[PDB]
Amino acid sequence: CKLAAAVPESHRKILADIADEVLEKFYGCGSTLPADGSLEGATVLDLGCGTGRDVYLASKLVGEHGKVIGVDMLDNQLEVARKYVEYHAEKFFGSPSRSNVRFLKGFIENLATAEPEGVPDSSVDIVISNCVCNLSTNKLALFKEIHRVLRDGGELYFSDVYADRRLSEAAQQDPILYGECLGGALYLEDFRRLVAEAGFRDVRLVSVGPVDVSDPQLRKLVPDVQFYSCTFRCFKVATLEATREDYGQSATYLGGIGEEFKLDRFFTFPREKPVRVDRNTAEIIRHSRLHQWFSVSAEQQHMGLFKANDSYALLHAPLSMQVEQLVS
Ligand SMILES: [Ca+2]
Ligand SMILES: [Ca+2]
Fold it and tell me: What domains sit in the chain, N to C, each tagged with a CATH number?
């Protein structure tokens, strides 16, 4: 894209250490990552890993007890990725033998058939990806395969392009819109239903930017469409509901991975201050790796829909309204 955020400062130093060939030949924008602290020990899977820029960056961040996997179908890019494993094993962990990464060859719509080896069920803590869905050959299958490899408490933490309305047939056939990742973009409500059908019942908005289509020829195919670049997190947690219910709970961020913990655009947790939370958010904290840095109170009796948030109306509103209101 031309939609890549600044590189986080905490990442600059690690990027200064990654093999220049991996950087020079890397296709696309950086897969955005959850707060660095939260990655310690995680198993992370990068969908469309290319030359491994983000796989190698996460290798350092997850530490020798964590694991990174990259999957791609581009022979050429994987060849580069595969030959720099030892390089980075010593760069990060003082010995060519001590790599915590591997690179697999496969369509991202089927992680089980990848080579050398497939990704087993319930094996991954964080799946990351940037701008891979709209060129995807089947989005439902891709979301299903994601849910499959995620462990309980795991998450999809990813960035993609979405639209605020359903693109016409003509727009979805156009080759230049398609290769720009616009033509295959989902209307956001349609995205929410599709991901729910794959198993992810609660889509959390992390950040959103505008995407412009200024070329008057293309614009004509999508006259009044607003596109967005959205980062979302979708947790795999067995007890989540479709709605955000109040069970009287509080969560308290204990510290240790930053001054504060920003879970999504609705919930910010300052160090050692209790914040009132709906039960889906409690359950996300309790069942995910985030449990390690939090204290979460017990569920009381149901109190109705969650309203203890200064943006509760937007919290319950369709995703479309959350995105459009939070760009502005
Ligand atoms: Ca990528
Ligand atoms: Ca709109």
Answer: 1-242 (3.40.50.150), 243-328 (3.40.5.100)
